[PDB]
Design a binder for these strands. Structure first.
Ligand SMILES: [Mg+2]
Ligand SMILES: [Mg+2]
Ligand SMILES: [Mg+2]
Ligand SMILES: [Mg+2]
Ligand SMILES: [Mg+2]
Ligand SMILES: [Mg+2]
Ligand SMILES: [Mg+2]
Ligand SMILES: [Mg+2]
Ligand SMILES: [Mg+2]
Ligand SMILES: [Mg+2]
Ligand SMILES: [Mg+2]
Ligand SMILES: [Mg+2]
Ligand SMILES: [Mg+2]
Ligand SMILES: [Mg+2]
Ligand SMILES: [Mg+2]
Ligand SMILES: [Mg+2]
Ligand SMILES: [Mg+2]
Ligand SMILES: [Mg+2]
Ligand SMILES: [Mg+2]
Ligand SMILES: [Zn+2]
Lengths: 63, 127, 25, 97, 214
RNA sequence: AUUAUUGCUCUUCAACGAGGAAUUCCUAGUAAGCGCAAGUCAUCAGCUUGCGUUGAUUACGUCCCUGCCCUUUGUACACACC
RNA sequence: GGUGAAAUUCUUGGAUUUAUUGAAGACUAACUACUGCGAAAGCAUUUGCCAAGGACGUUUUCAUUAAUCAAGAACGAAAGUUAGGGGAUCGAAGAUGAUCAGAUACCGUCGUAGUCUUAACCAUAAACUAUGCCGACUAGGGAUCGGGUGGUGUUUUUUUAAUGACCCACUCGGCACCUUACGAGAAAUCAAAGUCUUUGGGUUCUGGGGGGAGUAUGGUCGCAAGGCUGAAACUUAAAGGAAUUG
């Protein structure tokens, strides 16, 4: 299993009609110099660490 | 590189057609539609169906001989809506992601130098 | 009533008096 | 009273244009009074483009969009598409965005 | 308890001469049984492949081609010219607002006596210092361009068959002679032979057909 | 005091094995659990009004549902969409 | 297949999808626009023919020949009517599947007339700019369509030109938009709806509270349907317009 660590670098806001969902840009630690935006399920602030279960794939909007 | 045929995805609403044929057209090879792989009429065109039908159509396409195929996506046409149906894109997505190649695809929606009076009369379909 | 159908009301209405009068020509 | 100077829509020095049929309900409507959008969009879509090139031959291919002009009937234009309703004044503004 | 696939005869498609790959694709028939054979039955089919799918290069993305199958020989069937189409997307792109369109056509014969009808489309261009936002010709302009186009189109045909005409169409010689005679009249951009259909072939002549093959 | 005011003792020992579609209330000394005093009251609290005691889990967001505001806009309504 | 969802419906007659051809009639997509022309209705494929037209240019010609018009006449969307042809499509009537308390409908199916064309009718549309025509005057702005004039303007190369397309200024005459408002209006708005109690350039037509009523009658036109002309008795205190706040 290829674990993938990413540090939250900015809090962008709440998608999801409901709104339990937060848009976030992260910096993966093992070799930085690249970034990807993810969608969270729980409450999140800056400098948190998310376990991307598959490194390369991102979303945008939610309904 | 491969062996080639035609895809031709007719995608109207209330149903989505996928069927591959010989690059000459004259000879088929496996069809199946969206109305097949679910039963509810209402859902006869939905992307979830056309997937499952793009799945059953990819299967035979490779289980006979075609390794690859160009597509000719098509809407109702004529004096009708002319716009892409719902389960066309789902169909395309499902057949490339299946295990089949893609090459040079165009639209074949019949467009008229307009006429033959549209249906539903001058006052429109009103409800 | 719609003016259009009131005009039709009396179009007919005249056609009947046009008719009933003929019986007596 | 009156509500627009362009009356219904755009027709000055002509007296008769010629009807189109509504793309949504098929209602006839004079072509000048129509309301129109070029429905320029991609053949594939958002997600498909990766999975497109991925399982295809050629280098990145080319990619050729579809183009079809859309004709709405006011009500149909109002019921969904371009419409809202504007203030007495915003109405006057012909600028698109 | 059948599955015609466990029955169908199979076949590959070979292309004519003046292009790139003569090898094209595959097909299915039915085993040439006594009474209804694989041969005389179909074959006569046609195939549409983009010539950029058949010339290799991509400066030919549009321009589709109709090949018709005339003869057959032991898992090897040739094909010949049957038409030329354009892609729907290309036109739809060429045809933009704010400018005048122009179309004209003619029916005409060739050496090896195939009759055909070729098409031609051209749009008016703004010219690189114009201020007015549109650029329209003058009808009197449009009538001129057509007649000249027509004057040019008729000449380009009845050269040595579609054979040379095909050899003529591919490098779009026609396109620029149009471009040439025209600029004495009006600007114009795009300009292509767009379409050409077939409607009166001569006689089989198994000889002449066999001249593109080797 | 029977149609049994309430209280005690013995005996009798039910349904209920966490509850379908649905639906209520709630963000910190709060929820929930726990009992008290007060009102009523001759006698009777499974009710209420307050009270303190033990003391969490989870949001700190949104417009999806529902509810209401606000513009815009239509009105031939003004006893005003009953 | 068709829909919000369905059903009527079509399917060993391989339906729906595919391919190659063919026939029939209609139509003119995209280019199409605050763009063109016509008296108005109206008019968008090509090419040949037939006559016609405005604008412009004009140190040509004639010389008051003109403006507007009761009577009268030409043309006149759609439908409708007569007689042929045509009859693809869509489709008043009718019949249906559903919906509904009902559902003679909306939505779906079948589909007669019709839709197209010739010969003849009919003469009506919110036939709209709800705004007569001719002439004068009154105020700014950038676009544009046609014509013309001016330039040691651009771009086209060949050898400079000549052309053509383009650019800038101007000028007639078009279709419109913009901002202003001296001015007008009950207002909304209006470069006319302005130059009106400081009330007169020329001319045509219509209206005089509302209903009764475009009804009765007579005349007249029409195959008809109906067109044109067109009252009264009686009833009645409002009906109506533009703007405001709810
Ligand atoms: Mg509605
Ligand atoms: Mg009698
Ligand atoms: Mg109104
Ligand atoms: Mg009109
Ligand atoms: Mg007590
Ligand atoms: Mg109580
Ligand atoms: Mg109001
Ligand atoms: Mg055209
Ligand atoms: Mg007289
Ligand atoms: Mg008269
Ligand atoms: Mg018919
Ligand atoms: Mg009925
Ligand atoms: Mg019924
Ligand atoms: Mg009925
Ligand atoms: Mg009238
Ligand atoms: Mg109007
Ligand atoms: Mg001015
Ligand atoms: Mg009173
Ligand atoms: Mg009002
Ligand atoms: Zn509509």
């Amino acid at each position: 299993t290829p674990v993938t660590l990413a540090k939250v670098i900015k809090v962008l806001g709440r998608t999801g009609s409901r709104g339990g969902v937060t848009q976030v840009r992260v910096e993966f630690l093992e070799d930085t110099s690249r970034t990807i935006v993810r969608n969270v399920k729980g409450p999140v602030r800056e400098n948190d660490i998310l376990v991307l279960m598959e490194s390369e794939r991102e979303a945008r909007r939610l309904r | 590189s491969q062996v080639f045929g035609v895809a031709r995805i007719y995608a109207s609403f209330n149903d989505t057609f996928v069927h591959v044929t010989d690059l000459s057209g004259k000879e088929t090879i496996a069809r199946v539609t969206g109305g097949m792989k679910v039963k509810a009429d209402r859902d006869e065109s939905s992307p979830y169906a056309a997937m499952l039908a793009a799945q059953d159509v990819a299967a035979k396409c490779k289980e006979v001989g075609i390794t690859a195929v160009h597509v000719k996506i098509r809407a109702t046409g004529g004096t009708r809506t002319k716009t892409p149906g719902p389960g066309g894109q789902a169909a395309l997505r499902a057949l490339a992601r299946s295990g089949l190649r893609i090459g040079r695809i165009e639209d074949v929606t019949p467009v008229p130098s307009d006429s033959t009076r549209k249906k539903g009369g001058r006052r429109g379909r009103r409800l | 009533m719609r003016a259009k159908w009131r005009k039709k009301r009396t179009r007919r209405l005249k056609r009947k008096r046009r008719k009933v009068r003929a019986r007596s020509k | 009273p009156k509500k627009r100077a362009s009356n219904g829509r755009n027709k000055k020095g002509r007296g008769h244009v010629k009807p189109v049929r509504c793309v949504n309900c098929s209602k006839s409507i004079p072509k000048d009074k129509a309301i129109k959008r070029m429905a320029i969009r991609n053949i594939v879509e958002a997600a498909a483009v990766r999975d497109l090139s991925e399982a295809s031959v050629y280098p990145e291919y080319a990619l050729p969009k579809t183009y079809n002009k859309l004709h709405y009937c006011v009500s149909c234009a109002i019921h969904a598409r371009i419409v809202r309703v504007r203030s007495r004044e915003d109405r006057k503004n012909r600028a698109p965005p | 308890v059948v599955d015609p696939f466990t029955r169908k005869e199979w076949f590959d498609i070979k292309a004519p001469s003046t292009f790139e790959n003569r090898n094209v694709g595959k097909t299915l028939v039915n085993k040439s049984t006594g009474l209804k054979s694989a041969s005389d039955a179909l074959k006569g089919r046609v195939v549409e492949v983009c010539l950029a799918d058949l010339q290799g290069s991509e400066d030919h993305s549009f321009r589709k081609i109709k090949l018709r199958v005339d003869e057959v020989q032991g898992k090897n069937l040739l094909t010949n010219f049957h038409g030329m189409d354009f892609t729907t997307d290309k036109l739809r792109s060429m045809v933009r607002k704010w400018q005048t369109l122009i179309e004209a056509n003619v029916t005409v014969k060739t050496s090896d006596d195939y009759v055909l009808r070729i098409f031609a489309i051209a749009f008016t261009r703004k010219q690189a210092n114009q201020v007015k936002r549109h650029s329209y010709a003058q009808s009197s302009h449009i009538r001129a361009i057509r007649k000249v186009i027509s004057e040019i189109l008729t000449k380009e045909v009845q050269g040595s068959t579609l054979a040379q005409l095909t050899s003529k169409l591919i490098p779009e010689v026609i396109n620029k002679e149009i471009e040439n005679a025209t600029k004495d009249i009006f600007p114009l951009q795009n300009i292509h032979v767009r379409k050409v259909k077939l409607l009166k072939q001569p006689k089989f002549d198994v000889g002449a057909l066999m001249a593109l093959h080797g």
